[PDB]
């Protein structure tokens, strides 16, 4: 029983390790999209 | 009277610019919090 329930576990924590893997590679996207963005409109402002 | 009221409009256009950049500063440095601590996280997930 407790080898199983172990067993059950990890593949509970391995699907959630992929729901926050998939959560934090498109929250780390989003935060390099909008660093860019934020740099590009830095720039523009300087320019301005 | 025209130059005064250029410098005033671009002025006002910058601090919409500075006011908007430190909105998407503060989504970014939220966004990269998020990035970094999804990593860390995802470290401890492995660990265990």
Redesign the interface.
């Given at each position: 029983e407790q080898q199983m329930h172990l067993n059950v576990g990890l593949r509970k924590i391995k699907e959630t390790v992929d729901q926050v893997e998939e959560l934090r590679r498109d929250l780390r996207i989003k935060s390099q999209e909008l660093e860019v963005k934020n740099a590009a409109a830095n720039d523009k402002l300087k320019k301005m | 009277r025209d130059l005064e009221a250029s410098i005033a409009r671009?002025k006002e256009?910058?601090a919409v610019?500075?006011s908007?950049?430190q909105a998407?500063?503060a989504?970014?440095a939220a966004?990269?919090a998020?990035?970094n601590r999804?990593?860390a996280?995802?470290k401890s997930?492995?660990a265990?």
């Amino acid at each position: 029983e407790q080898q199983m329930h172990l067993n059950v576990g990890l593949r509970k924590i391995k699907e959630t390790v992929d729901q926050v893997e998939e959560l934090r590679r498109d929250l780390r996207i989003k935060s390099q999209e909008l660093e860019v963005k934020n740099a590009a409109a830095n720039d523009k402002l300087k320019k301005m | 009277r025209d130059l005064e009221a250029s410098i005033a409009r671009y002025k006002e256009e910058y601090a919409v610019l500075i006011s908007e950049a430190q909105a998407i500063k503060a989504d970014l440095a939220a966004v990269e919090a998020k990035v970094n601590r999804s990593t860390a996280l995802l470290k401890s997930l492995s660990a265990e």
